[PDB]
Design a protein around this ligand. Structure first.
Ligand SMILES: NC(=O)c1ccc(OCc2cccc(Br)c2)cc1
Lengths: 194, 198
């Protein structure tokens, strides 16, 4: 069940599709980035069409929608990374086994400006920086802490019934951490400069 | 997609089903265990019916079967663990982030044994305060594998010039495999829990 806005892949399962500037889709993604990164220069935006990652993600979304007995389990977040990690993320998504103050998971920012820090979106030998726009199954979350390897339980009376993710601040989150494969789908890759 | 042999779970997502000795399902697992663990005695064998783990596992299996083309991608292996880990494994499966360092490390992942004797070591299936030891029988997507290395946090590439095209798992010895390491969630489905004693 590949999404309607994807483009044909000639019977293949993985493609990076460069977006046409000025079209509805490109405009939407660029605006999410310029809300906090208007001082940067966008070189291109690519749609990630990874059928396998999408299928595993959508299975997890359907399960989380059942478990939590509502939708509203998904957020669009940012992830800055180095050039050498981009091929892996495009093909395999996010891997917690690759500062982790809120737990040993994959970190996602609410604001592109956070992911735009050189510590995350490391400029490559050519000055290029890389940031993903990511569908993240944040679900029901709680405050994180150092050394978590999974989210805490929602009630220590049932230690296996877990929060879906953790954050820095439940009332006004700025970051989320997820601790499982296929809780995050890398949807767009922004290539940009300072 | 739930298997038709499973008990009806009345819209519940999870159940453990105690098997009966003399059924082929029980006997095949007891024989697989006793081939290398005849000095131990089985208390019970439970079928793990975990709808969400099954769904995610079967998605990964279909993907590996597509990608590899006509490989036997799935092996039935053993995993010994401590009693404190059993509720988590039953509900959530095998988390590499929780895995112990193996005495012979072929990577930083979850380990699965070919022989029940390996998993039956107290270092894995730690006896609980009542002398009960716990071993899972696990469907593992071993796929295409190579000899592992202690530094791995994912399987190595098949080709160093294409670093994202990975082996599916690693092993101690490709000609005589006795352990497999997997590095991804939902690559192993806990199918049976064997409770056993000396
Ligand atoms: N890779 C990313 O885009 C990214 C990396 C890290 C991150 O948050 C890390 C963090 C940890 C503790 C305190 C703060 Br404020 C931020 C948020 C996002």
């Amino acid at each position: 069940n590949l999404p309607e806005h994807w483009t044909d892949m000639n019977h293949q399962l993985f493609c990076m599709v460069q977006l046409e500037p000025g079209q509805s889709e490109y405009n939407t993604i660029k605006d999410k980035f310029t809300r906090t990164c208007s001082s940067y220069a966008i070189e291109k935006i690519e749609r990630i069409q990874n059928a396998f990652l999408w299928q595993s993600y959508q299975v997890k979304k359907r399960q989380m929608d059942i478990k939590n007995d509502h939708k509203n389990n998904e957020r669009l977040l940012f992830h800055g990374t180095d050039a050498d990690s981009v091929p892996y993320v495009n093909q395999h998504g996010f891997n917690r086994s690759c500062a982790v103050s809120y737990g040993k998971g994959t970190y996602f920012a609410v604001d592109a400006s956070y992911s735009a820090k050189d510590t995350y979106s490391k400029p490559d030998s050519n000055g290029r920086k890389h940031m993903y726009v990511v569908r993240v199954l944040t679900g029901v979350f709680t405050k994180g802490r150092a050394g978590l390897v999974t989210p805490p339980p929602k009630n220590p009376h049932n230690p296996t019934d877990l929060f879906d993710s953790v954050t820095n601040n439940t009332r006004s989150p700025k970051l989320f951490v997820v601790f499982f494969d296929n809780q995050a789908y890398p949807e767009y890759l922004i290539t940009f400069t300072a």
